[PDB]
Swiss-Prot record:
Changing I161V: In P9; increases fluorescence at 475 nm excitation. In R10-3; matures to the red-emitting state with excitation and emission maxima at 555 and 585 nm, respectively. Photocytes. Changing S26R: In mut1.28; shifts fluorescence lifetime from 3.03 to 2.76 ns. In mut2.2; shifts fluorescence lifetime from 3.03 to 1.94 ns. In mut3.3; shifts fluorescence lifetime from 3.03 to 1.88 ns. Contains a chromophore consisting of modified amino acid residues. Maturation of the chromophore requires nothing other than molecular oxygen. This is Green fluorescent protein. Belongs to the GFP family. Changing Q62M: In Citrinine; leads to excitation and emission peaks of 516 and 529 nm, respectively. It comes from the Eukaryota. Changing F92S: In alphaGFP/cycle 3 GFP; improves folding at 37 degrees Celsius, reduces aggregation at high concentrations, and increases the diffusibility of the protein inside cells. Green fluorescent protein has been engineered to produce a vast number of variously colored mutants, fusion proteins, and biosensors. Further generation of mutants led to more stable proteins (at 37 degrees Celsius for example) with brighter fluorescence and longer fluorescence lifetimes. Pfam families: GFP (PF01353). Changing I121V: In EBFP2.0; shifts the excitation and emission spectra to shorter wavelengths and increases quantum yields compared to BFP. The gene is GFP.
C-alpha cells in the first residue's frame, strides 16, 4: 500500500503449454502506481512463441492501477501486499480453445513478482491462435469492471478482449477472473467500480529474440 508510492521493479515468469506446445516467458520492468503506469519487456526464453503475443498481454499486475485518493479504500490489489494474491482466469477464444492461468503476485524483497502457469486446450492447429493470424495490437481504451466476491475474501471480473484478425474480422477472447489473498491479514473488499485501461505494444529494435514491449496506463474510477 505504502509499498507503491515510488517506482517498483517487476519480474514476470510464465510457464505455458498450449495443446502440448510448451513455452516460457521471462519479463522485467517497472510499475509506478502514482501515475498508474507499467513498462515491461517480455522475452520468450524457449525460442519461438507458439501463440500470438497479444493473447498473453492480460496474463503477463493490477496493483499498479492508479486508485485516486477518494477510492483508496477500494484497492484490493495493493491491500493484499506484501504477501500478495492469487489471480486466476479462464480465457475462452470463441470457436477455438481456452487458456486457464494461475498466477501469484507478491513481493520478493523489493521486487514485485508475477509467477504464472498457463494451460491451453482444444485449439485448432491452424486456428487464429496456433496459426498466428492476429495483428500485433493492444487496446486503448477500455473498461474492466471489478466486483467484490465476499465468500472468497476477494474480487472478480469478467471482460472481453477483441483481437483483430489479419483477413479483417475479430477474434473474441472472453475473460473470467478471480483474485484471492495469499495471506490471512485483512483485505479491502471494494464496492462496484471499474479500471480504465490503455495498453500499447512495441518492439525493441535491438532485441533479436522473440519479445514484446508492453506499456499500460490504468486508472480506477466509478464511485
Amino acid at each position: 500500500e505504502e509499498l507503491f508510492t515510488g517506482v517498483v521493479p517487476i519480474l514476470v515468469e510464465l510457464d505455458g503449454d498450449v495443446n502440448g506446445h510448451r513455452f516460457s516467458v521471462s519479463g522485467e520492468g517497472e510499475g509506478d502506481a502514482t501515475y498508474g503506469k507499467l513498462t515491461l519487456k517480455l522475452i520468450c526464453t524457449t525460442g519461438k512463441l507458439p501463440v500470438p503475443w497479444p493473447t498473453l498481454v492480460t496474463t503477463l499486475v493490477q496493483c499498479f492501477a492508479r486508485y485516486p485518493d477518494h477510492m483508496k479504500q477500494h484497492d484490493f490489489f495493493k491491500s493484499a501486499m506484501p504477501e500478495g494474491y492469487v489471480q486466476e482466469r479462464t480465457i475462452f477464444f470463441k470457436d477455438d480453445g481456452n487458456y486457464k492461468t494461475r498466477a501469484e503476485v507478491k513481493f520478493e524483497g523489493d521486487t514485485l513478482v508475477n509467477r504464472i502457469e498457463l494451460k491451453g486446450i482444444d485449439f485448432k492447429e491452424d486456428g487464429n491462435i496456433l496459426g498466428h493470424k492476429l495483428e500485433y495490437n493492444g487496446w486503448c481504451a477500455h473498461n474492466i469492471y471489478i466486483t467484490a466476491d465476499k465468500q472468497k475474501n476477494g474480487i472478480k471480473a469478467n471482460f472481453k478482449i477483441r483481437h483483430n484478425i489479419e483477413d479483417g474480422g475479430v477474434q473474441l477472447a472472453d475473460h473470467y477472473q478471480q483474485n484471492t489473498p495469499i495471506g490471512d491479514g485483512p483485505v479491502l473488499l471494494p464496492d462496484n467500480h471499474y479500471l480504465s485501461y490503455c495498453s500499447a505494444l512495441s518492439k525493441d529494435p535491438n532485441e533479436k529474440r522473440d519479445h514484446m514491449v508492453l506499456l499500460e496506463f490504468v486508472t480506477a474510477a466509478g464511485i
